[PDB]
Design a protein around this motif. Structure first.
Motif, mmCIF file in Angstrom:
data_model
loop_
_atom_site.group_PDB
_atom_site.id
_atom_site.type_symbol
_atom_site.label_atom_id
_atom_site.label_comp_id
_atom_site.label_asym_id
_atom_site.label_seq_id
_atom_site.Cartn_x
_atom_site.Cartn_y
_atom_site.Cartn_z
ATOM 1 N N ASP A 134 0.435 -1.065 0.201
ATOM 2 C CA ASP A 134 0.089 -0.108 0.225
ATOM 3 C C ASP A 134 0.875 0.945 0.121
ATOM 4 O OD1 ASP A 134 -1.938 2.456 1.072
ATOM 5 O OD2 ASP A 134 -2.966 1.113 1.426
ATOM 6 N N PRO A 135 0.210 2.411 -1.209
ATOM 7 C CA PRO A 135 1.388 3.629 -0.972
ATOM 8 C C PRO A 135 2.101 4.459 0.659
ATOM 9 C CG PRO A 135 -0.107 3.241 -2.623
ATOM 10 C CD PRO A 135 -0.424 1.911 -1.864
ATOM 11 N N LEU A 136 0.632 4.324 1.224
ATOM 12 C CA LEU A 136 0.783 4.837 1.960
ATOM 13 C C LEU A 136 1.524 4.232 4.035
ATOM 14 C CD1 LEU A 136 -0.450 5.735 5.201
ATOM 15 C CD2 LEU A 136 -0.079 7.248 3.624
ATOM 16 N N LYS A 137 0.981 3.432 4.542
ATOM 17 C CA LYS A 137 1.507 1.914 5.177
ATOM 18 C C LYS A 137 2.648 1.750 4.886
ATOM 19 C CE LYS A 137 -2.074 2.172 8.825
ATOM 20 N NZ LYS A 137 -3.544 1.012 8.999
ATOM 21 N N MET A 138 2.850 1.194 3.430
ATOM 22 C CA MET A 138 3.408 0.184 2.868
ATOM 23 C C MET A 138 3.656 -1.247 3.398
ATOM 24 S SD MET A 138 5.253 2.854 1.390
ATOM 25 C CE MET A 138 7.046 1.621 0.084
#
Lengths: 129, 130, 129, 128
Positions: free
Chosen positions: C112-116
């Motif tokens: 996920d681009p946010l939490k990775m």
């Protein structure tokens, strides 16, 4: 004459700020000058063997707008001055909408790579340019 | 042979993802190997005088956690094997909080600065690290 | 499904040894993976819209022969294994003579681009390949 | 005047056997970053102040080359400060203090997120 060279921006060219690292544009400018030479059938790898190379003596870059990951850029290059052992390049980088990202003036000197001492520009190169 | 080398992360090492570019770690590992060799007086100058240069033949890197802008990292290096023309380096990178970020196994071969072809390890090197 | 990507070697890619710096090849491999995905319309923009990003988890490169300034190389890329949350890329770099310069095996994970944090590959990607 | 040492590695050199000119640009940036850290402005402290810096104009003059394994010294000083910008005067010398190159760098203070010009916080202004 205006030489144009496309450059795609990859992760390697960007920084944590989310835009192209300022030193990366410097490399893009070098690629463009190299491609201008190749357009005239000149290879710097071949030239080094003949003890002919080009080095940046002075360079000024002004930045106006950023480039981002995946942008396809265009490097524009023009030789505005040619002297005994040197030449002046005027270059600029624009994006897909022709927004001026930055521009540079580059003083390049021809040198003998082994001694790193200036030498007259080859006639074959002057003839083409 | 454990050698520690500190490395500060600058903008040039990061990418738009907000972390260190994966290929930048490879450069960090190279610096650490260069500095470990220097620690044993095998500076580039000394190596050149011995008609020797090192080229990477194989490298495996494991990415565990990211390094970020301005992190002070520590690259840890050890030579775990030396045979014929080959040297095997085992390296790892940790952050200030000592978190494991990356790990690498590097097989390097010895070559003459000219022909770029493999050559036997100089007597001085085997003698120094054996 | 073999994707081919041309790459020209510039001064920035070489080192004092007169050949391409080994880490430069790692960057070349990344460009090729990016371009293979682009070829299937999975640009960085498209992936972000799918709310996914790809990160390298494990990579091995074996070096055989060198490349030099001005060489035009070809990076060959293929997805040799597609899993629910990861992809294995097999890549290789050859020169104009088609000599094998080096090859790589890359394990990339979808996050996920946010939490990775790990995330399953989008169905659009699964469907495409 | 702030001094910052830098060792030249293979990654910084090119086939010409000298340091690639763009590498010096990166060296200058490291020096500016370290000068700021020295004055209590690490990247963490800068983020806390909601400040990021962007190069607006840069001129570099190259006199002599640096080579593999040279230990250089980057010298940095802030010579001008005005509203939202700062001018850095820097130079690179080798172990014998020979002048390799020098640069003048105009930097602009911006918000990290939007990267739009913003007045230099008094915390930094009151620092220099």
């Amino acid at each position: 004459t205006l030489f144009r060279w496309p450059v795609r921006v990859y992760y390697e060219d960007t920084d944590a700020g989310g835009v192209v690292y300022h030193a990366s544009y410097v490399a893009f400018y070098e690629r463009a000058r190299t491609e201008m030479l190749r357009h005239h059938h000149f290879s710097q790898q071949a030239l080094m063997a003949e003890r002919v190379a080009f080095v940046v003596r002075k360079m000024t870059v002004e930045y106006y707008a950023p480039a981002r990951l995946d942008d396809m850029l265009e490097i524009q290059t023009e030789i505005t001055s040619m002297r005994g052992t040197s030449l002046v390049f005027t270059q600029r980088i624009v994006n897909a909408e022709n927004t001026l990202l930055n521009e540079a003036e580059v003083l390049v000197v021809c040198v003998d790579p082994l001694k790193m001492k200036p030498r007259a520009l080859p006639k074959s190169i002057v003839a083409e340019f």
